[model samples]
Target chain A: EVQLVQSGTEVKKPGESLKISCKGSGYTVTSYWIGWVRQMPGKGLEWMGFIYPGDSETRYSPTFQGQVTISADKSFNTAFLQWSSLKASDTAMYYCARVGSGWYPYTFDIWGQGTMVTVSSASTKGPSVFPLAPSSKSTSGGTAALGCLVKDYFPEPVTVSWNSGALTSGVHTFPAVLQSSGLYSLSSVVTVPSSSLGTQTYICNVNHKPSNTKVDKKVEPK
Target chain B: EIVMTQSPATLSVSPGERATLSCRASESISSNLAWYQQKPGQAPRLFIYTASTRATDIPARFSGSGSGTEFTLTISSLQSEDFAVYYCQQYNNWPSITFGQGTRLEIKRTVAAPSVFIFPPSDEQLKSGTASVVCLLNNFYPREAKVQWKVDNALQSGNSQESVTEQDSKDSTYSLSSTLTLSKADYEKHKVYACEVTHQGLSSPVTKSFNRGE
Candidate 1:
C-alpha cells in the first residue's frame, strides 16, 4: 500500500534553478528512509543520495555530492532534490524510492513514477542521416530489406519517408530511442520484391521540424 | 575514495550468543555510515544508518555504534535467521561511495544442503520469442550458494538474474530462484540447458539439466 508520488516534468534552461518533490504515503515517512536515483536518458541508474525525514539527516553519493541537494520535511512526508543551477547534461528522469528496512533491508521496494527534467539550450539538434544499406538477413519469401539508421536528433516527432515519398506497404519505422548522450536515434526499414534486388534504387528522407531540416540517403542495390 | 575494511572475514558464533562485527574507514567520516545484511542469492537489506541509528522495524537486538573512521554492528543475541553476511558502507567521500568486503556470520552447527529443481521455458514464453529457464534451490541453510548456467556444455554468462533468498517462516530454511533468459532463436539452437549449484554442505556440486527434446 506504500506510495511515493513525484512532481511533474519540468523544462528548464541552463542556469535555471529547480526543486522537485516526492510525497510519501501509506506509512510514516519519518520512520523510513527515502532516496533519489538518476537516470540520464538511456544511461543506467545512478544513486544520488537519501534522506531520513524524521531528523532531516541526508547523505549523498560521492558522484553527486556537490551537484545537488537532498532534503525532507517530516510533517509533509515529502522528500526533495534540488539544484541551484541546471545544465543541459542534467536532463534525466529522477526517481524516488523508499529504502527498505527490517526483513527487507537495503532494497528500494516502493518507487515513484519518476519526474523528467529536460534542460535545453537555445538551439535544437538536427538529425544525421546514414547511408541506406541492404539488410544481411532478408525477409521471408524472398523479399529484400533495406535499413536507414538516423542518429543524433532531438525534439522528436521526426518523420521518415521511403523511396522519396511514403510507401504504404513493407515500410516499418521504429520509435526514436534515446541515446546516452541525450540525443535520439531511429531505424526505418523497407522491404521489396527480390526480383528488383540489384536493379532497384531506394531513397530514405528524414524531416525534423524543430531544427527545420530535411535529410535524405539513397541506396543502389548491388 | 575512502576504503572500507571489515574485520575477521568470517565470524563463528552459536545461536543465542552475541556477535560483534567491525568496519573501519580509511578516513574520518563523521557518522555517515550504513550497514546491510545479505544472504546467498538475495539482495541486501539496510539495517542501520548514521552509524548508530537502527533502520525502521529493525529489532532492538540489532544495534550499531562508533564514529569517525571506526564502526561496529552488534547483535545482542544471534537468532537462527541472523546468520548471514554483513556489509558496511561509507558515503562521506563524494564521487566514491565504497562498501566493506563483508563479514560472514556462520552458525557453529552443521549446514543444510540444497535441493535443486530446474524448470524449462513455458510454451507461452517460447511463443513470445523470449524464453526463460528457472532454477530453484530449496531447504538450504547457512544461506550461501553459487549458481551457474550452461547452454549445451558451454558456460553462459550475463543471461541470468538471481532472486533474493527467502527464509521459510516455519523452518528457517532458505530458498532461492535464478532465471536465465534468452531469445527464442538462441534457445532453439541449444539442445540442453543446465543449472549448476555449489554449496558448503555438498561434497560435489549439484547439476540439473533440462533437455529441449524432452
Candidate 2:
C-alpha cells in the first residue's frame, strides 16, 4: 500500500516564503520519481514537474519554471515544494504523486491527500450579503422563509441579525462551509407570517470582527 | 508541449483474441511512457509503466512494448472484463505530461442495447414551477453512450441538470439516469420532450419521448 502524506493547510501573506512537504512510505522512495501537480481554485490539474530522489534530478513545466522549487530528501522519504515569495495568485491545492517506474514512468498512480495553500494580504475578510428567493408554504402555518446568503468571508464567527435585531425563534443559521477558493459561505433563514409576503420588507445584517465590517441586504416579496 | 495521438479510436475484437492499441508521440519520449485502463464510471488504473514494466498486480497477459515515438499496449488474450478504454501517457517531455485521446476496445459480438424509460415530473413538482424530467437508461453493454435531450424537436444545449451512470456488479452492465429541469411554464410551452441515446450496441439511436399533452 503505497502512500503519500502531505502537509496541512497553509495561510500565508503575499511576499512570504513557504515550503510544503509530502512524505512517502511503504516503498523505496529513492528508486521512483515523484511529481507535483497544481490545481487552482476551479481550475483543472496542471503538471508542475517531477524529481528523482535517487539523483535529485528535477524537471519543471515551462509554465511553472522559475515559479516554484521542487526538492526531496530520500533519507526521510519526503519531497518538498517551496515558494521564495508567494503571491495572491499562488492560492491553490497542491498534490504530490508517485510516478510509475520502469518501462513507463508517466503515470501518477499514488497521490497525497493534498495540501491547501491560501495566499492573501488580509487574514480576515468581510462577508458579502445577498438575499435568496423566499420559499412560501401553507403547511407550516402559512409561513414564508427569507434566506440571506453570506459569501467570501474568512476567520468565521459571523453574526446574522434580522432587521438589525436577533430573533430567538424561527431562525435557522447553517454552519459555515469552506470553499475550494479558500473562502467561507453561510446561509441564514428567517420565517415570517405569509401575510407579510408582498407587503413587508425584510433586512439581513451580517457582522464580522477583525475586519470589523457589517453588511446589510434587504429583500421584498413580489 | 508534446502531443500524444492514439490510432484506431475504436478497436473491435472478440473474446480470447489478441488486441493491440497504438500510441504515438509527436517527439521522442524515450521509454517514459505508461499505459492505463479506464472503465465506465471508474478512475483510470495504471497497468504498464516505464514503457514495458508491469505495475504491481497487473496481469501477465496485459503487456506494453515500444519506446521513443511509438508505443503499444498488447493484450495477449482479451477477457470479457478487458473491454475498456486504454490511454498512453508520456513523461519524457518533463514538466509537460501528455496523454493520448484514448482507444476504446469493444466486443465484436452483439450485446445488450440500453432500455430507455422517461419519468415525468409529479403533480406536486409541476405546481412548484420547477419540474424535473428524468430519463433512465438500463442494462447497456460497452458502457459508453451519448445522451441528448430535445424539447419540441430542437436540441437542448448544455448538459443535463444532473446525470449519473453506474455499473451493475452482478452482470457488468451499465445504467444511467439523466435529469433535465425547467420551469413548469416552459415545460407547458413544449409539446414533447425526448431523450436520445446512441451506443454501439444499438442498431439505431433509441429515443423515448414525454408528451406533455398526454
Candidate 3:
C-alpha cells in the first residue's frame, strides 16, 4: 500500500550541502516512518537512517550519524536525505524507504523513482537543493544527468558501472572539481523501473595515483 | 514496557465443548488489538483481531473482546477433532513484534459436557442438563502463542479443540487466540479451570482462571 514518487536531481560541489526529496502516495505518510539509503557506485546496500515526518523523530545509522542528515517535512508530504559535504565518492544514487512496525524494516515496499544531483555552476543559495533547471523527465533509454568533481589526489577519470543483468549498462562522464576540503566530489542521477528500483546497483572507481581507491553503496527501497 | 503474561504452555481440549486462551499485558493496550491462531505445520492465522474483526473465511462461532490487558479466546462449539497450537502478536513498535511460546493442542477429553442422569429415573419425566461454557481473548499479536485448558488444574485428555491459524494479511504481523468449551457441570465440578496463552521468549503469560460462577 505504498508508492514513493521522487523529485528530479541536482549538482553541487564538495563541502557544499545537497538535499534530495521523495514524495509518497497511497499511504498515510505521517503514520509511518521513512528511511534513507545510499547506493554508491558499487558497494553493498547501506541503511543511512529514518525520519518520522509527523513527529520529526529521527534514527540514524552509526555509519551516517554525523555524515548525513535525514528528515521528513509533513507539510510538504516529502522526506529528505541530505549531505553537508558532497564527495565524488558520495556520487552514487540515493533512495527513500519506508519502515513497518513488523519483525524487520528490511522490506522496501515502495520507492520514489529517483533523483540525480550534480555539483556544477555557481550556487544561488547556501545549497541549491532544488531543481538544477526546469528540465523534463528523461525519455526512455536516455541519459538524465551528468556531474563531475576533480580533486588534486584523484586527477583521473572515474568509471561508473551499472549493475543490471542482461540489460544495457548505462554510463556517462561528468566534470569534477576540488572543493574547500582537500577532497574530490561530483553529482549524478539515473532513472529506471519502479519495480527493479532497489535491485539495481551502481559502482564508481577512481584508479588515480596516491593509493588508488574505490567506494560504492546501494540504494534500496524503504 | 508492556508486560504480557500467557499460560498453560501445553493443553488438550475436546471437540463440541468450550475453549479458552488467556493474555494480559503489563499495561492497557486498550482494546487496541485482537488474537490469531496457527497450526503446528502452518503459518499463523488471524481468528479475531481489532476487537473481533474476523478475517473473511473464519468460523462464525469465533469471537473476542477484553479491556486493559486481560482478555480471553473462546470457541462456542468445537468441531470434529480440531486441534493446533496458538500464538500472540502485538503491534507495539517501541518493542517491535513478539510471539508467545506455542501450546500444542492435543486430544484431551472428547466426552460431551457431562449430562444429568435423572437420579430416580423419575416416576414422571426426567430432566437432563448439559454443562457448557466458552471463553474470549482480546487484542494481541506475535503468532507464537498457545492456548490450553485444565480440569482441576490437571492437564486434560486430548487437544481436540485446538486449532491453528494463518496470517490474516501476508503483509502485516499477526496474533492468535485459542478457546476451550466444556460442560457447565464438568467445568463447575472441577476445582479450578485454567486458560493460558504461553509466550515462549517473553515473560510468563497473563492467565485468567475460572471457578463455580466465573
Model 1, stretches more than 4 Å misplaced?
A1-62, A69-79, A83-222, B1-4, B7-14, B28-71, B79-109
lDDT of 3: 0.47
Which lDDT tens digits does candidate 3 get at residues A167-192? 23222223333434333433222324
What TM-score would every model get versus the actual structure? 0.45, 0.56, 0.30
Order of the predicted models by lDDT, top scorer first: 1, 2, 3
Question: Considering every candidate listed, which one attains the maximal TM-score?
Answer: 2
Predicted complex 2: CAPRI docking category: incorrect
Worst 10 residues of 3 chain B by lDDT: B114-123
Could you give the interface RMSD of candidate 3 in angstroms? 32.5
Query: Quick one: best DockQ, which candidate?
Result: 2
Please provide, for model 1 over A158-183, each residue's C-alpha lDDT reduced to its tens digit, 9 standing for 90 to 100: 89887767564655565565554566
TM-score of chain B of each: 0.64, 0.70, 0.46
DockQ in order: 0.03, 0.10, 0.01
lDDT by residue (tens digit), candidate 1, B1-214? 7878898888978789999999999999888788877665344567888788886878999999999989999999999879888888776743245778789887754578976766666554466676667666666786779999999899988777665333444555566666677889999998999999999999999997867856
Give residue B8's error in model 3 in angstroms: 45
Ranking by DockQ: 2, 1, 3
Q: Lowest summed-lDDT stretch of 10 residues in model 1 chain A? A: A131-140
